[PDB]
Amino acid sequence: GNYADELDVDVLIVGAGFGGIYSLYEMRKLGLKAVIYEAGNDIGGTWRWNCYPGAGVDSEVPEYQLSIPETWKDWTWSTNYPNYEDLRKYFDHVDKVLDIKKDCAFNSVVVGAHFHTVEGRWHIRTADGRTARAKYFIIAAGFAAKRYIPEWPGIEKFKGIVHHSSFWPDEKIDVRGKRCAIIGTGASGVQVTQAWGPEAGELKVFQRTPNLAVPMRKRSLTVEEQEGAKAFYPELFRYREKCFAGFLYTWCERGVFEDSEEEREQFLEKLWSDGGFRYWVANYKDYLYDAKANRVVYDFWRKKVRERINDPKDQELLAPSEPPHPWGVKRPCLEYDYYEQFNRPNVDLVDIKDNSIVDFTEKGIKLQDGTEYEFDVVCIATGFDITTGGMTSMGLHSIHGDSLKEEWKSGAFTYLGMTVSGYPNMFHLYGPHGPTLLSNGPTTVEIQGRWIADAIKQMERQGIKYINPTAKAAKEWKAKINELSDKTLFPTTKSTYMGGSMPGKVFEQVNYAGGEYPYSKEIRAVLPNFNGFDIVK
Ligand SMILES: Cc1cc2nc3c(=O)[nH]c(=O)nc-3n(C[C@H](O)[C@H](O)[C@H](O)COP(=O)(O)OP(=O)(O)OC[C@H]3O[C@@H](n4cnc5c(N)ncnc54)[C@H](O)[C@@H]3O)c2cc1C
Ligand SMILES: NC(=O)c1ccc[n+]([C@@H]2O[C@H](COP(=O)([O-])OP(=O)(O)OC[C@H]3O[C@@H](n4cnc5c(N)ncnc54)[C@H](OP(=O)(O)O)[C@@H]3O)[C@@H](O)[C@H]2O)c1
């Protein structure tokens, strides 16, 4: 049925993660024939494929789920910060309540897409030779696309167990008493470090740049306290769409230097205590916008983290006097006992800032000054390539015949962070030029989801064949993306530290930095007239 060799649908969705599950939901309400092409065999996105030791949410319950009444009605969590196993069981519950799988074609890897302007339809080709033709094309393909491993020829030779964090196997590797390595101190590294520290015989963490990690206030939830709150879950889900990063909190109405030295200490203690990303996006409104303001947030962070690390050498490495970059310039890691792990005599932080990893060997890995380390298990928690999402990665072709990969070689150009000029009736959720990485995933998805479902609703009512963003509209959006980011302390091409900079492409801000509320207003302005689109009946 959904696996037919030439598939006729109104809507083709790529991905069965949050983005694809919510898009499918919205399409069913419009009464359109829709199908998800999913590369994998189950729904959940990153929560199925890209799981690793001690992986779980950094968003607090009930922030990280769908606002769909019927999905959370009889659902509760065991804890306020669930892990990947809890999330997997949540997606089973969403499938049991909505029957998502009925409209999925699994092991469907999209390798090509071209829009036939005369037909007014996408032809969407899978790796295994099937093709769907659809009026509307929705890409819920995620941002954790293109796992980044640096140029280490040796990996082939290494005798031990090695994987990138996002490719860690389902079947857990017993690391108890083994020599393990973690390369990277992003959320992935930090999460794995907390998981391996307690059990590994020896463990080495290879740190170029330290994580500016903030405390996770994890606790058990009862079914009772949750069922009690659900009176106002609807209001809560609406409140996150009013909040800068789409959590149940946003910026303090005050800037750093409206408060005294005592008032700051107390206010910052309160955010630290309360936990989550309050320190990141419930802090003084100007700390991401002014250097002196940033430094005050940094120093307090430095004080709190130093209290937890015994060795003065590790103290300096894990929380330096001089910031490696402005505080909160990248989504920090929500940690539980990261800093405690480096107090263990089996754990060892290695400074590679000036002494790069040259290559892997048979035994383990080797550095610039010729230092070698022998290992049994290595997790490569290096970056992703977020120059763009998995949008360039599925052979999307414009109506000018060029690939999106090609048209985006000098930098990404979307309109409203949901559409691309030369890709008519093509929509993306949780991708470039959306709140995306500066946001609660499910919040941004629902804002964007509702806009795509309205956009599609309007095209059906007004009798529109296709809409296509103008280069003028896309350039103006790019100008906006850059105007919001350039006010901030976010890295620029002139910055000494440019997190996730790559040889291939130029470095640029990829997310909308204006907040969920101003974003919602921007995208809402353009309906129902489709301002900035070529309209064809
Ligand atoms: C361990 C972990 C924890 C996280 N915790 C949080 C958190 O607490 N808060 C937060 O805000 N964000 C968090 N994130 C980020 C997370 O990626 C997003 O919040 C969200 O899960 C993305 O949903 P999505 O559906 O947009 O993407 P994904 O979940 O990545 O789904 C994309 C889907 O597209 C499919 N696909 C890709 N390419 C193709 C193709 N060519 N053809 C067909 N199918 C294709 C994939 O197989 C996948 O099913 C976390 C990520 C990880 C890995
Ligand atoms: N837990 C989560 O919520 C989660 C999970 C997955 C992804 N994400 C998102 O997607 C991104 C990926 O997160 P991540 O934790 O996997 O990794 P990351 O934050 O992208 O950082 C990877 C780490 O690897 C280091 N590194 C990169 N190349 C290296 C090299 N050649 N040699 C040595 N070290 C190297 C980086 O150092 P430098 O800092 O010096 O470059 C960095 O410490 C994040 O920005 C995050 O927002 C989030």
UniProtKB/TrEMBL annotation:
Against InterPro entries, the record matches this protein to: FAD-binding_Monooxygenases (IPR050775), FAD/NAD-bd_sf (IPR036188), Flavin_mOase-like (IPR020946)
Q: Which cofactor does it need?
A: FAD
Q: What keywords sit in the KW lines?
A: FAD, Flavoprotein, Monooxygenase, NADP, Nucleotide-binding, Oxidoreductase
- So where does FAD get bound? G19, E38, T46, W49, D58, S59, Y64, V110, R331, G441
The answer, when asked if NADP is one of the entry's keywords, is yes
Q: Tell me which residues bind NADP(+).
A: Y52, T185, A187, S188, R208, T209, K330, Y497
MF terms from GO for this chain are: flavin adenine dinucleotide binding; N,N-dimethylaniline monooxygenase activity; NADP binding
Q: Report which superkingdom the organism of origin falls in.
A: Eukaryota
The record's annotation in SUPFAM superfamilies points to: FAD/NAD(P)-binding domain
Q: List the Gene3D superfamilies.
A: FAD/NAD(P)-binding domain
Q: Which Pfam families match?
A: FMO-like
Q: Which family does it belong to?
A: Belongs to the FAD-binding monooxygenase family.
Name of the protein: Steroid monooxygenase
Source organism per UniProt: Aspergillus flavus (strain ATCC 200026 / FGSC A1120 / IAM 13836 / NRRL 3357 / JCM 12722 / SRRC 167)
